[PDB]
C-alpha cells in the first residue's frame, strides 16, 4: 500500500489529507519486527507528497531523517527511492554546514560495509553535497596538517605536536545531526573506497583526490544499479586479447587433511 | 579555524603585461642587447658568422653576440618565477630599440631559429602566436620608464658595487613596490648604460658573473623570498 | 685547488648530466643536431627529438660559470646517451657559441682527450661510481618526487660527504637513467624544470648552504 500510495492512491482522493495520520504513524513506526523497520522509508515518499501539496509539517524532520539512515538502508532494495527524496531534502538553502557534514560523515561511515551498488550511489551524492556546501570541503582535507618546505623549524615542531594530540571528534551515537561534531572530523573512510576491488567503483572514489571541476553529478545515472546489472555490463565486453595467466605454480589446489593455493580448505 | 577558499581548483596565474602596473613584479632589463639585421637576405649579425660584414659596418665584432641575449631569455623565461606569473622581461637593443617580452612566449632553444625571430621582430615590429590570439614580442616606445610599474625599485648589476644578498634585499623592500634589475648583456663594457634612470647599483657576487648566471641567481632569490617555489 | 676524480676526501658538488645526446657523424665527423641533421639522423634510425646537444651545452655553461665553480667546489661529469663518460675539468672555459662547442666536441670523442699547451676534457671509463667520492650522496631530479629545499637539504647532509645530482639533459624521457646508482630521487620545484635551470637552482642553494657567495 505504501509503495503505490504516492502515485496510485493519493491523486485519486478528494481530501488526501485524511492519510496524514496513517502516513505519520507509518513514518514513526518502531517495532520489534525487523521486517517492519523498512516501513518509515516507504512512508516518507507518501508523506512528502502531502507535505508538498497542502503546506503541512512534520516536527523535527531532519533529526528523524538522520536517524533513519542506518546500515539496513544501504542493503534494502528501496535505497534508490530513499536517495531520490534525500537529495530534495538536502538541496534546501537553509541547512547548516554541520547538519550536512553529519549526513556526509554518516553515509561515508556506512560505505565501509555497503555493496558496490550502494557505493555507486553514495559517492556522487557526497560529491554534490560538498559542491553545494564548500564549507564541508574541510572534511576532505585539513590544510593545517599539510607540511610546507619553507615552514620554519619551530613550525615543524608545532605541526608534530598537533599530529600527536589529534582525536577524531565524530560521535556515532548522537542523534542530533547538529551536535555530532562531524564538521571537525574527516572523511577518512572515503579514502579506503579508492582501493575498492572493482575498478569502476575505485575510479569514482578517486574523484575526491581530484579537482572539483564538475558542477554536479546526475544521480539518475548512478541510483538504480544492482549486482545483476554490473555483471551484465562486464559480460558484454568482448575478448580482444587473451587473459593473462599466472607464472607461479601450485601443487595442490586445496590443503590436505608442497604449495597450496587455498590453505584451510580440504576436499 | 580560518575557513577554506570556496574554489580550490588550480587557477592559472594571470599573464602580467605592461598595462598592469599595480601588481608586485620582478622586471629583468637586458640592457645593451646586440641585435642588428643586415641584407646579405636579412640575418641577425653575429660575432662569428658575420665578421667581414661587421668590419665593413665599422662595428667591433667583440660586441656582436646575440647569443648572450638569447641565453638570458632562456634562463629567465624558463625560471619558475616566470611560471608563477611574477616576472616580465624587457630588452634594450644597443641601437636604442626597446622590446617587450610577453611572459607566455617560448623562444626556440636553438640559436639559429632565435635569430630568425629577431629579424622577423625587428622588421615586422611584432610577433604573433601559433593560434593567433596574442602578440608575444612587441617593440615598444622608449623611454623604459613609462612601461614599468608606477612604484618600483631599480638596481643594476655592478661588479664594482658592494656585494649584497638578493634574498635579504628583496625581503627588506616593500610589497606594493616592484623590483627592476638591469642586466648588461654585453660581453664587456662600462656599467653606466642605465645610470641615468636607476637610483643605485648593487653587486651580486664577488667573483665576476655572466649575464645568464647573474639573472638566474637574482630571480632564484625572489622565488625564495616570495616563496614562489 | 682544482678538484679531480683522483681526490675523494674533499667535499664537493658533483653534477652528472645524464643521457647527453652527443654523437659524431660523417657523410667529415660533425656533431649531430636535431635540426641541422634531420635526414642524416633518419638514415641513422635515431629520433631527431633526442638529438639536441644544445641543452647539454647550456647546462655546462651555467654549471661552469656558477660562482661555486669559481670557488673550486664543483666538478662535472657527462654521461652520453651512447654510453660515453666525460670528465669536465673545472678550469675549462667552453665556447659561448654552440657552433664552436660542437667543433670541440667532435675533437674530444675522436681524440678521446683535449689538451692545452691537465686535460680540460677527458673521456673516462664507466661506471661513474668509481670516479665518484668514497663517501657521497646521490640524488636525481624527479618531477614526480616530493619537492625539497636545496638549501635545507645540503645543510642537513654531513660535511665530509659529497653530493651528486644526476641531471637529465634529455628533452623528454623517463627519469630512470641513474636509478641503478642513486639511492633516492628528490623534487626541486613543483613546476617542471629545464636541465639548465634545475642545475642552476641547485648550485645557487649550495652557494648559500656553504656560504660560497
Amino acid at each position: 500500500i505504501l509503495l503505490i500510495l504516492h502515485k496510485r492512491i493519493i491523486p485519486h482522493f478528494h481530501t488526501p489529507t485524511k492519510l496524514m495520520d496513517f502516513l505519520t504513524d507509518s513514518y514513526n513506526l518502531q517495532s520489534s519486527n525487523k521486517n517492519a523497520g523498512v516501513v518509515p522509508i516507504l512512508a516518507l515518499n507518501g508523506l512528502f507528497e502531502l507535505m508538498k501539496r497542502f503546506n503541512l509539517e512534520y516536527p523535527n524532520f531532519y533529526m528523524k531523517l538522520y536517524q533513519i539512515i542506518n546500515p539496513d538502508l544501504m542493503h534494502v532494495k528501496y535505497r534508490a527511492r530513499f536517495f531520490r527524496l534525500m537529495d530534495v531534502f538536502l538541496s534546501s538553502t537553509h541547512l547548516s554546514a554541520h547538519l550536512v557534514a553529519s549526513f556526509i560523515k554518516k553515509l561515508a561511515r556506512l560505505t565501509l560495509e555497503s555493496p558496490p551498488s550502494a557505493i555507486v550511489t553514495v559517492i556522487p551524492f557526497i560529491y554534490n553535497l560538498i559542491r553545494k556546501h564548500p564549507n564541508c570541503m574541510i572534511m576532505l582535507h585539513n590544510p593545517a596538517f599539510i607540511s610546507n618546505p619553507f615552514q620554519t623549524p619551530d613550525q615543524v615542531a608545532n605541526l608534530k605536536t598537533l599530529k600527536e594530540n589529534y582525536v577524531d571528534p565524530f560521535d556515532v551515537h548522537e542523534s542530533d545531526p547538529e551536535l555530532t561534531h562531524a564538521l571537525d572530523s574527516s572523511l577518512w573512510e572515503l579514502a579506503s573506497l579508492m582501493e575498492h576491488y572493482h575498478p569502476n567503483v575505485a575510479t569514482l572514489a578517486k574523484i575526491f583526490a581530484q579537482p572539483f571541476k564538475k558542477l554536479s553529478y546526475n544521480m539518475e545515472d548512478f541510483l538504480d544499479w544492482n549486482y545483476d546489472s554490473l555483471l551484465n555490463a562486464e559480460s558484454s565486453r568482448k575478448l580482444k586479447t587473451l587473459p593473462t595467466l599466472e607464472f607461479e605454480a601450485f601443487t595442490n589446489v586445496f590443503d590436505n587433511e608442497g604449495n597450496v593455493y587455498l590453505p584451510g580448505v580440504a576436499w | 579555524q580560518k575557513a577554506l577558499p570556496a574554489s580550490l581548483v588550480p587557477q592559472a596565474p594571470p599573464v602580467l603585461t605592461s598595462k598592469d602596473k599595480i601588481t608586485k613584479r620582478m622586471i629583468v632589463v637586458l640592457a645593451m642587447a646586440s641585435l642588428e639585421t643586415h641584407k646579405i637576405k636579412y640575418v641577425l649579425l653575429n660575432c662569428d658568422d658575420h665578421q667581414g660584414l661587421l668590419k665593413k659596418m665599422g662595428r667591433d665584432i667583440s660586441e656582436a653576440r646575440p647569443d648572450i641575449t638569447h641565453q638570458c631569455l632562456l634562463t629567465l623565461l624558463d625560471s619558475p618565477i616566470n611560471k608563477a606569473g611574477k616576472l616580465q622581461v624587457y630588452i634594450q637593443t644597443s641601437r636604442g630599440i626597446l622590446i617587450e617580452v610577453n611572459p607566455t612566449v617560448r623562444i626556440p632553444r636553438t640559436f639559429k631559429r632565435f635569430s630568425g625571430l629577431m629579424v622577423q621582430l625587428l622588421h615586422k615590429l611584432s610577433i604573433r602566436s601559433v593560434n593567433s590570439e596574442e602578440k608575444l614580442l612587441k617593440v615598444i616606445k622608449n623611454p623604459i620608464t613609462d612601461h614599468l610599474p608606477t612604484k618600483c625599485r631599480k638596481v643594476t648589476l655592478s661588479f664594482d658595487a658592494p656585494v649584497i644578498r638578493v634574498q635579504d634585499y628583496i625581503e627588506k623592500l616593500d610589497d606594493d613596490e616592484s623590483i627592476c634589475v638591469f642586466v648588461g648583456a654585453m660581453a664587456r663594457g662600462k656599467d653606466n648604460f642605465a645610470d641615468e634612470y636607476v637610483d643605485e647599483k648593487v653587486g651580486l657576487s664577488n667573483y665576476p658573473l655572466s649575464a645568464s648566471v647573474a639573472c638566474s641567481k637574482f630571480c632564484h632569490g625572489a622565488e625564495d623570498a616570495w616563496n614562489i617555489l | 685547488p682544482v678538484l679531480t676524480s683522483k681526490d675523494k676526501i674533499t667535499k664537493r658538488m658533483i653534477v652528472v648530466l645524464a643521457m647527453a645526446s652527443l654523437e659524431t657523424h660523417k657523410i667529415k665527423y660533425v656533431l649531430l643536431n636535431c635540426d641541422d641533421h634531420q635526414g642524416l639522423l633518419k638514415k641513422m634510425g635515431r629520433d631527431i627529438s633526442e638529438a639536441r646537444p644544445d641543452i647539454t651545452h647550456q647546462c655546462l655553461l651555467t654549471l661552469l660559470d656558477s660562482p661555486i665553480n669559481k670557488a673550486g667546489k664543483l666538478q662535472v661529469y657527462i654521461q652520453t646517451s651512447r654510453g660515453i663518460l666525460i670528465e669536465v675539468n673545472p678550469t675549462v672555459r667552453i665556447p659561448r657559441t654552440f657552433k664552436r662547442f660542437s667543433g670541440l666536441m667532435v675533437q674530444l670523442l675522436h681524440k678521446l682527450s683535449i689538451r692545452s699547451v691537465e686535460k680540460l676534457l677527458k673521456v673516462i671509463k664507466n661506471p661513474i661510481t668509481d670516479h665518484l667520492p668514497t663517501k657521497c650522496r646521490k640524488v636525481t631530479l624527479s618531477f614526480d618526487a616530493p619537492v625539497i629545499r636545496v638549501q635545507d637539504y645540503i645543510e642537513k647532509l654531513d660535511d665530509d660527504e659529497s653530493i651528486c645530482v644526476f641531471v637529465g639533459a634529455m628533452a623528454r624521457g623517463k627519469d630512470n637513467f641513474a636509478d641503478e646508482y642513486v639511492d633516492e630521487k628528490v623534487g626541486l620545484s613543483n613546476y617542471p624544470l629545464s636541465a639548465s635551470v634545475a642545475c642552476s637552482k641547485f648550485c645557487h642553494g649550495a652557494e648559500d648552504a656553504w656560504n660560497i657567495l
Binding site: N200, D221, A233 | - | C34, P192, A195
Partner: peptide
C-alpha cells in the same frame, strides 16, 4: 550513461602546453 564511461573520463582526466626543454614545432 554507463559507469564505465565516467571512469574513462576520470582516468583520462589524470592523463590530461610546452614543458621542460620541449622546443617549438618544426616546419
Amino acid at each position: 550513461r554507463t559507469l564505465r564511461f565516467y571512469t574513462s573520463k576520470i582516468d583520462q582526466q589524470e592523463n590530461k602546453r610546452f614543458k621542460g626543454d620541449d622546443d617549438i614545432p618544426y616546419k
